[PDB]
Design a protein around this ligand. Structure first.
Ligand code: 613
Length: 377
């Protein structure tokens, strides 16, 4: 199994114990590390943060401590939008300009591949022709990668994609059987399945449906989404299940109504470290629990939640990650990806479950605890 962990270049700006640098990554923890995010200018891949180049060096330098470790650079993200992707795929000339820049960029800075985080083809401004043009881009990139590898006599660069979990987003975004042929890995974003935008409490990444999930809401769980991707053309061995190391919090409209489906009046408070409205890092949730929040267990969905006063949070813990991992193995998927390494209790001082308690749970469950970890010669 693969254990693929996303690192974010804005975690460096968090205060105190929240600050996370590439050198805070345990090089022996994950099999793949992905750098988020890269940007685009004039149809060419570029940096986003002022010090990205310095961080690439330290990020990719982790491979000097683990000979098996592979690294990828993720382009796009939520704030990046669709517009630069649309303009890039719209002509064959722009696609070539992009692919060329990617090959040069990844080789220069020592990445082993590219991760597409276009959110999404066919939606959020992206016109309907982008569904097929994304497949075209991926195919062209894969083929360019195969040719380059032979000309320079080095291992082929990987091409992977972070993909939607929402069925409507999937249906208008991806030609699954064709796209699956060219992608090395398919990183399914099985999270943000519920949140405050809905107007009631729900889970970030529930494994199964809640009994009250009716109609299209019955699709808002990990099991359904992963099986949708599989039943519609994606090989199970290529499919990578998305694991969140954060939860979504809510302001409860009635503090005495604390279950699943309880009415909410908006997003929960930003945490003191990530400072994301409606989102708490796992280590921020641990603080919530230590300060006296009531532990809940969403039994049908195999995920925890917690509440105190008018604040309710739905998230993942050690138990739920372990349950999901056994499910993953039974279903014989390619492995797990993690958003994000910097959101797990990396110091171990928040949750008292060891360093990286959530990702370590996956490393152990997926049979990677004994996997070789030696510096390259
Ligand atoms: N890819 C996305 N559409 N999303 C998943 C990750 N999301 C997030 C953002 C900030 C923190 Cl601290 C934790 C999670 C932002 C929305």
């Amino acid at each position: 199994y693969q254990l693929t962990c996303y690192f974010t270049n804005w975690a460096q700006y968090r205060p105190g114990l929240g600050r996370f640098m590439p050198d805070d990554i345990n090089p022996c923890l994950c099999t793949h590390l992905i750098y988020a995010f890269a940007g685009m200018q004039n149809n060419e891949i570029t940096t986003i943060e002022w010090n990205d180049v310095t961080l690439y060096q330290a990020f990719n330098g982790l491979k000097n401590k683990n000979s098996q470790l592979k690294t990828l650079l993720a382009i796009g993200g939520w704030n990046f939008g669709t517009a630069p992707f649309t303009a890039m795929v719209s002509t064959p000339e722009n696609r070539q300009t992009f692919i060329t820049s990617v090959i040069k960029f990844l080789r220069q800075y020592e990445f082993d591949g590219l991760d597409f985080d276009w959110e999404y083809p066919g939606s959020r401004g992206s016109p309907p022709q982008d569904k097929h043009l994304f497949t075209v881009l991926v195919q062209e990139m894969r083929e360019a990668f195969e040719q380059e590898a032979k000309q320079i006599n080095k291992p082929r660069l990987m091409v992977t994609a972070a993909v939607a979990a929402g069925i409507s987003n999937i249906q208008s975004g991806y030609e699954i059987p064709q796209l699956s042929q060219y992608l090395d890995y398919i990183h399914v974003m099985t999270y943000d399945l519920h949140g405050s935008w809905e107007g009631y409490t729900g889970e970030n990444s529930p494994l199964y449906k809640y009994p009250t999930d009716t109609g299209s809401n019955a699709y808002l769980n990990v099991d359904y989404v992963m099986n949708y991707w599989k039943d519609n053309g994606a090989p199970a061995e290529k499919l990578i299940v998305g694991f969140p190391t954060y939860g979504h919090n809510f302001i409860l409209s009635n503090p005495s109504n604390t279950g699943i489906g309880a009415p909410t009046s908006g997003a929960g408070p930003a945490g003191p470290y990530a400072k994301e409205s409606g989102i708490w890092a796992y280590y921020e949730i641990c603080t919530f629990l230590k300060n006296g929040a009531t532990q809940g267990w969403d039994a049908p969905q195999e995920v925890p939640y917690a509440y105190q006063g008018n604040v309710w949070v739905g998230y993942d813990n050690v138990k739920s990650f372990d349950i999901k991992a056994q499910w993953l193995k039974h279903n014989k998927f390619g492995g797990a990806m993690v958003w994000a390494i910097d959101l797990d209790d990396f110091t171990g001082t928040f949750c008292n479950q060891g360093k990286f308690p959530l990702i370590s749970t996956l490393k152990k469950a997926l049979g990677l605890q004994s996997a070789s970890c030696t510096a390259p010669a």
